[PDB]
Amino acid sequence: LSTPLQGIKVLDFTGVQSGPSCTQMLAWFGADVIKIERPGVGDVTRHQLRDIPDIDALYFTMLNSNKRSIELNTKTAEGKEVMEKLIREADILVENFHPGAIDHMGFTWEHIQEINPRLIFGSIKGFDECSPYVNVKAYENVAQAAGGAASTTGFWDGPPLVSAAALGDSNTGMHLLIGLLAALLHREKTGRGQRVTMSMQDAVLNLCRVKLRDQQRLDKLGYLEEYPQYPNGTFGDAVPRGGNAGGGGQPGWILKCKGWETDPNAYIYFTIQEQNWENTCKAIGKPEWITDPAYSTAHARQPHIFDIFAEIEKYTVTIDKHEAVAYLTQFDIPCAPVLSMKEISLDPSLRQSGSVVEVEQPLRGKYLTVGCPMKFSAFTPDIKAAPLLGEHTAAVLQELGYSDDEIAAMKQNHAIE
Amino acid sequence: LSTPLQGIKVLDFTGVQSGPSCTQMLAWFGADVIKIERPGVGDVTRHQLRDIPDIDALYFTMLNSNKRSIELNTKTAEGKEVMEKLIREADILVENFHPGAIDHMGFTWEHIQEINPRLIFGSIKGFDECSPYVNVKAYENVAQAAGGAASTTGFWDGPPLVSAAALGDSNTGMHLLIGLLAALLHREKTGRGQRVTMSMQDAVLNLCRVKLRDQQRLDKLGYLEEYPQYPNGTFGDAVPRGGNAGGGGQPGWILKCKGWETDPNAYIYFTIQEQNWENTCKAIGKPEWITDPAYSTAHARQPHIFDIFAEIEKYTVTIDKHEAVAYLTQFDIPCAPVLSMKEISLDPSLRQSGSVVEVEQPLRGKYLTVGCPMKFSAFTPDIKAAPLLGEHTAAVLQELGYSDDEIAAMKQNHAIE
Numbered sequence: 001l002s003t004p005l006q007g008i009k010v011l012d013f014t015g016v017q018s019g020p021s022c023t024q025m026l027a028w029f030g031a032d033v034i035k036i037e038r039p040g041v042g043d044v045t046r047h048q049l050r051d052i053p054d055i056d057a058l059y060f061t062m063l064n065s066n067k068r069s070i071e072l073n074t075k076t077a078e079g080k081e082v083m084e085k086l087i088r089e090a091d092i093l094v095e096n097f098h099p100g101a102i103d104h105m106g107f108t109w110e111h112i113q114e115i116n117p118r119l120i121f122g123s124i125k126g127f128d129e130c131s132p133y134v135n136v137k138a139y140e141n142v143a144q145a146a147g148g149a150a151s152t153t154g155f156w157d158g159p160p161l162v163s164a165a166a167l168g169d170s171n172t173g174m175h176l177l178i179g180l181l182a183a184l185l186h187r188e189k190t191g192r193g194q195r196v197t198m199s200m201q202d203a204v205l206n207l208c209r210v211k212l213r214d215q216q217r218l219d220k221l222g223y224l225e226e227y228p229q230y231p232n233g234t235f236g237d238a239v240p241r242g243g244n245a246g247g248g249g250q251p252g253w254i255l256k257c258k259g260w261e262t263d264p265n266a267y268i269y270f271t272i273q274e275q276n277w278e279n280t281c282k283a284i285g286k287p288e289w290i291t292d293p294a295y296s297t298a299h300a301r302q303p304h305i306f307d308i309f310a311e312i313e314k315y316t317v318t319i320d321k322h323e324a325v326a327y328l329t330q331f332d333i334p335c336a337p338v339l340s341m342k343e344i345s346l347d348p349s350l351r352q353s354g355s356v357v358e359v360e361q362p363l364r365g366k367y368l369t370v371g372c373p374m375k376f377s378a379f380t381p382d383i384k385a386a387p388l389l390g391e392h393t394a395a396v397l398q399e400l401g402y403s404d405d406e407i408a409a410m411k412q413n414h415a416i417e
Numbered sequence: 418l419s420t421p422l423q424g425i426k427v428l429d430f431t432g433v434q435s436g437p438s439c440t441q442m443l444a445w446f447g448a449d450v451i452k453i454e455r456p457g458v459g460d461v462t463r464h465q466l467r468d469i470p471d472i473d474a475l476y477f478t479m480l481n482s483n484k485r486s487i488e489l490n491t492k493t494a495e496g497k498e499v500m501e502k503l504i505r506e507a508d509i510l511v512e513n514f515h516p517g518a519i520d521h522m523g524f525t526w527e528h529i530q531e532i533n534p535r536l537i538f539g540s541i542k543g544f545d546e547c548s549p550y551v552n553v554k555a556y557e558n559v560a561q562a563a564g565g566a567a568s569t570t571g572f573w574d575g576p577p578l579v580s581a582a583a584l585g586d587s588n589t590g591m592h593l594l595i596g597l598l599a600a601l602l603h604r605e606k607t608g609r610g611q612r613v614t615m616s617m618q619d620a621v622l623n624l625c626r627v628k629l630r631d632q633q634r635l636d637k638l639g640y641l642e643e644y645p646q647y648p649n650g651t652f653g654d655a656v657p658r659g660g661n662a663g664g665g666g667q668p669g670w671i672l673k674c675k676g677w678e679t680d681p682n683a684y685i686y687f688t689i690q691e692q693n694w695e696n697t698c699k700a701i702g703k704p705e706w707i708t709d710p711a712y713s714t715a716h717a718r719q720p721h722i723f724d725i726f727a728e729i730e731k732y733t734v735t736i737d738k739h740e741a742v743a744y745l746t747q748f749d750i751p752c753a754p755v756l757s758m759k760e761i762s763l764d765p766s767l768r769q770s771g772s773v774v775e776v777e778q779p780l781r782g783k784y785l786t787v788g789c790p791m792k793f794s795a796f797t798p799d800i801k802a803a804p805l806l807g808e809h810t811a812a813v814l815q816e817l818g819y820s821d822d823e824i825a826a827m828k829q830n831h832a833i834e
């Protein structure tokens with residue numbers, strides 16, 4: 001019946017993942033999202049990591065559902081004219097091109113404001129405007145390195161490690177999305193748009209907040225009691241890599257289940273929750289550990305925590321990961337299996353919840369995407385195909401007032417060049 | 418002058434990180450956020466990982482800036498009365514307690530709706546309502562395991578690995594935040610609140626979208642051309658662990674810089690951007706690689722990509738990471754240093770950008786927090802101290818109509834029990 005953003009007009013001047021992820025969600029909340037793409041090639045994701053010759057890649061289809069596509073060279077005087085008219089009629093413009101790119105076309109925040117003082121301008125960059133790295137190009141892992149994630153992820157005796165999760169890309173997109181929605185609410189009171197910027201470095205940092213917590217702890221005490229280097233190894237000046245440690249106030253580890261020698265996902269994540277120690281003891285057949293002072297409190301457990309994980313793993317290694325969780329959760333233990341992407345892709349509850357979603361794409365047939373991650377009692381998004389390149393050029397030009405001949409003339413002229 | 422959410426009243430019925438992260442941002446956007454905490458202990462984070470005896474832990478102070486605290490036992494008939502009055506006057510209630518917890522107090526979505534049909538109810542859980550894991554407890558890494566991150570992060574010959582980034586916690590908080598803001602906009606049209614749910618598993622999955630992309634690629638072709646196992650190793654049924662691979666359409670790796678033998682952060686992230694190959698060649702003194710067909714295209718590079726990273730590392734290993742980036746970025750290469758948490762905590766540009774922020778906490782003095790990650794041209798949040806336990810009980814009760822004697826009587830009675 002109604003959606004949060006019905007009537008909102010969005011200009012999607014974006015590429016790759018960070019920007020497109022934000023705008024796809026805008027479309028899913030009911031906005032009309034017009035992706036503005038360079039003529040003939042469009043969004044780089046259309047052609048990266050193709051699994052079928054000549055059609056849009058999954059990279060593109062999974063990030064651009066529910067959008068309209070117009071082909072437009074904004075470096076041409078004509079492209080600029082159309083662009084200006086689109087900005088005049090739009091509520092939101094999002095861009096995530098390299099530092100300086102859109103300014104050099106002449107769509108500076110300052111100018112955009114003059115065309116449309118109700119427009120909310122959303123901009124993603126690698127880094128903040130006062131960063132020494134302000135003009136640096138950033139892909140996913142560059143941000144993961146700049147943002148403290150790579151330094152803190154992996155093992156103490158291994159290199160910094162990148163996370164599979166898009167900390168730099170979709171995460172940055174989610175963060176801009178928050179700002180854009182907040183600007184929409186703010187405009188309800190002021191009557192004015194504003195500019196919202198988000199850096200990929202800052203998105204990564206936001207998710208690494210508890211590591212800035214631990215840095216302060218470590219500056220003050222010289223050790224981190226729950227980290228694996230305590231009490232037998234060594235702390236340096238910086239928060240170290242912790243392996244599969246819990247990262248919070250509840251120790252845990254990634255434990256081997258049956259099949260691990262061969263199946264890289266034959267594992268669970270097991271949490272030793274402080275207030276569930278007794279149950280945990282009952283789960284693993286160590287009732288004696290309920291009152292033994294070397295085990296009865298977390299503080300007592302810590303110095304020999306790996307001997308505890310080792311005992312638990314003596315159990316988990318013997319059954320299938322799904323059975324281990326089936327058993328262990330009856331004792332109210334926080335655990336789950338390490339689900340592979342294959343398992344996720346076929347899970348019926350994720351289908352049922354609208355988290356993994358099938359979509360019919362022209363020319364390609366069916367694909368899977370991740371759906372709208374949060375669930376609303378008042379509406380449900382309908383996740384639709386991604387646009388073919390320039391599929392809506394004509395429609396979007398007619399909406400701007402261009403006649404059929406005008407449209408035909410601009411395409412012809414373009415073809416003729 | 419004005420903030421996005423001025424006038425919005427929020428009930429923060431949350432603990433730990435996922436829920437509190439969402440509500441802290443609400444306060445930073447101008448909402449009045451009332452944290453509702455059990456009498457005498459409050460949010461578990463107040464007492465976890467303390468670095469100073471008897472005062473609120475950094476865990477708490479970094480997640481609860483700008484909030485008011487009321488102590489309230491919502492299991493008592495009296496606690497329930499106050500609670501109901503708070504829900505009557507509030508715009509948003511957020512909760513992230515264990516599955517079943519708030520229902521069993523009698524604040525079921527259904528009832529909340531009857532008290533206040535304009536209230537937006539926000540709820541975080543480990544898993545979705547139709548999940549077989551709906552009643553399972555979830556901390557950070559349990560979600561990272563359930564959501565595909567752990568399966569896909571780390572090395573091919575190592576265990577699944579957790580990410581330092583809060584994929585399960587603050588990330589889930591950010592996602593609910595998006596829903597809550599979208600519900601606020603929706604209520605501007607319908608006059609009605611609604612319920613917004615977010616699972617930690619689904620937050621993790623959203624960030625692992627490109628891994629569901631790769632799962633489909635792999636189902637279709639049986640190999641992933643840009644992954645390290647191509648072409649000399651082996652693919653199984655599931656997307657594998659890739660080490661420090663780029664994760665997208667632009668190969669990369671984590672490279673050693675001078676000091677690595679001793680300093681676990683003496684490294685960069687280096688991207689081989691397809692459209693910058695020539696520059697890259699010039700950067701490393703391999704101009705011959707510009708036209709050599711074994712190197713001139715990405716497709717040609719892939720089968721011997723590690724011999725290329727090895728050559729680049731022959732350079733990076735000789736200088737300090739900061740100098741390596743200083744040099745390499747003049748050639749427009751995407752790279753950054755792996756910044757340690759220590760470096761981040763002291764970085765002047767992050768101070769300047771309001772990303773790392775100093776706050777004065779009563780009894781503790783100064784601490785560092787991560788500030789409001791997105792930047793707005795129309796306002797700037799003022800990041801303030803976190804509340805002491807029950808600091809605002811009296812004020813919040815007076816706002817509800819309770820008299821001074823009433824307040825004094827409820828505290829006395831509580832003390833007397």
Ligand SMILES: CC(C)(COP(=O)(O)OP(=O)(O)OC[C@H]1O[C@@H](n2cnc3c(N)ncnc32)[C@H](O)[C@@H]1OP(=O)(O)O)[C@@H](O)C(=O)NCCC(=O)NCCS
Pocket residue numbers: 015016017018019036037038039072073074075096097098099100101102104124125126136137138139140168169200692751
């Ligand atoms: C991802 C990134 C590094 C890619 O950089 P890149 O491929 O070298 O350059 P871009 O795709 O941004 O821009 C290429 C050109 O296309 C141009 N362009 C974009 N849309 C166009 C259009 N509709 N018509 C004409 N030109 C267009 C840009 O202006 C640029 O031209 P210029 O070099 O003359 O200024 C860069 O866009 C970036 O750092 N973005 C900000 C951070 C970000 O979001 N990262 C991506 C994470 S998924």
Ligand SMILES: CC(C)(COP(=O)(O)OP(=O)(O)OC[C@H]1O[C@@H](n2cnc3c(N)ncnc32)[C@H](O)[C@@H]1OP(=O)(O)O)[C@@H](O)C(=O)NCCC(=O)NCCS
Pocket residue numbers: 275334432433434435436453454455456489490491492513514515516517518519521541542543553554555556557585586617
């Ligand atoms: C984090 C989590 C696992 C912790 O579980 P836990 O410590 O065993 O249990 P909780 O803190 O949720 O609840 C403990 C009790 O406090 C009660 N409680 C909470 N606030 C209260 C208040 N103001 N007054 C009285 N009781 C209160 C709860 O109802 C519960 O009582 P019950 O067992 O009789 O139902 C759980 O809250 C959870 O899975 N939350 C959902 C997912 C999530 O957000 N995870 C945290 C990621 S940072």
